[PDB]
């Protein structure tokens, strides 16, 4: 997250760290949202590689013991059937991870609230992106969970020539684009928490940013619109 602030330890309990094994250690590569005690929602591009992944819930500082972490392996990876690794702009950047075991819920580990199917946020709706992603374009991962205030940019505006044009689809949510704050590598798969009727709900799954950089003016961070996949999500959980 570029231009963010350190999130309070108990602010976003549904946020998880998706890590892959590298040698005798683990490396954070993406974020995700715990949606069931044994299911995590993340971006499909986060699990394209043939890597061994693990999920960490109750995480805050990637480099120090917080005394709240739970580590669990990934049992099954269900990527959306229409996902195409070489066409992120086409959409369908979403995947569900069935965990090897069900995590314990507490102050630091909670299921993320998902919006009702079809829900679209009004322009400039209040949202926060969270994650351990790079703190600067081509920079390095944050040690502590970061959050950045990223108001939404409606589709009409986001799909205009000055912004993302045809690159953005109706199945996506745009947020930010102020040139200072944004998601960045390592935030992918993580949540976009938006305030609706007094309650924060995970409306987006971090998908992509401009190849020009992370925090680029009029190039808001783009997320898979969660409300467009409610049926898909339920279908997967019900049959897996």
CA atoms within 13 A on the CB side of 170: 3
Looking at the Cβ atoms of 115 and 131, the one nearer to Ca ion is 131
Whether residue 188 lies in the annotated active site: yes
Q: Tell me whether residue 233 is exposed, middle or buried, using C-beta atoms within 10 angstroms of its C-beta: 0 to 12, 13 to 18, 19 or more.
A: buried
Minimum Å distance from CB 38 to Ca ion?
A: 21
Separation CA 214–CA 206 (nearest Å): 12
The 52-81 site mask, x for binding Ca ion (CB under 5 A), equals ---------x----x---------------
Residue 144 binds Ca ion (CB under 5 A): no
Maximal CA-CA distance, the chain: 48
Considering the complex, what minimum distance in angstroms separates the CB of residue 126 from Ca ion? 28
> Around 59, how many Cα atoms within 13 Å sit in the side-chain half-sphere?
30
Question: In sequence order, what DSSP letters do the residues of 164-179 get, joined into one string?
Answer: TGGGS-TTEEEE--SS
User: Does 239 participate in catalysis according to the annotation?
Assistant: no
CB of 66 vs Ca ion, minimal distance in Å: 4
The CB-of-62 to Ca ion minimum distance in angstroms stands at 6
**Among 28, 45, 60, 203, the one annotated catalytic:** 45
Name the 3-class secondary structure at 37. Answer: coil
Query: Interior CA angle at 222 toward 220 and 226, to 5°?
Result: 140
Structure token digits, residue 25: 């250690």
| CB-nearer residue toward Ca ion: 54 or 98 | 54
Among this protein's residues, is 45 annotated catalytic?
Answer: yes
Q: Is 64 annotated as a binding residue?
A: yes
Q: Is 69 annotated as a binding residue?
A: yes
d(CA 192, CA 153): 13
Residue tagged active-site, from 125, 188, 207, 227: 188
Binding-site positions for Ca(2+) read 59, 61, 64, 69
Site for Ca ion, rule CB under 5 A: 61, 66
Q: Which residues are annotated as a binding site?
A: 59, 61, 64, 69
Among all residues, which ones are annotated catalytic? 45, 93, 188
């Amino acid at each position: 997250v570029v231009g963010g602030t350190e999130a309070q330890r108990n602010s976003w309990p549904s946020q998880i760290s998706l890590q892959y094994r590298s040698g005798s250690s683990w490396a954070h590569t993406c974020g995700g949202t715990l949606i069931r005690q044994n299911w995590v929602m993340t971006a499909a591009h986060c699990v394209d590689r043939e890597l061994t992944f693990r999920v960490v819930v109750g995480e805050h500082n990637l480099n120090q013991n917080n005394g709240t972490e739970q580590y669990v392996g990934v049992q099954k990876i269900v990527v959306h059937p229409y996902w195409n690794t070489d066409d992120v702009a086409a959409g369908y950047d979403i995947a569900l991870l069935r965990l090897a075991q069900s995590v314990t819920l507490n102050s630091y580990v909670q299921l993320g609230v998902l919006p009702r199917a079809g829900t679209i946020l009004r322009n400039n709706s209040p949202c926060y992106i969270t994650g351990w992603g790079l703190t600067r374009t081509n920079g390095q991962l944050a040690q502590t969970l970061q959050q950045a205030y990223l108001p939404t940019v409606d589709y009409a505006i986001c799909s205009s020539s000055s912004y993302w044009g045809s690159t953005v689809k109706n199945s996506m949510v745009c947020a930010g684009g102020d040139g200072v704050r944004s998601g960045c590598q390592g935030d992918s798969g993580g949540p976009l928490h938006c305030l609706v009727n007094g309650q924060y709900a995970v409306h987006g799954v971090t998908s992509f940013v401009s190849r020009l950089g992370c925090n680029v003016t009029r190039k808001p961070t783009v997320f898979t619109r969660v409300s467009a996949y409610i049926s898909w999500i339920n279908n997967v959980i019900a049959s897996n």
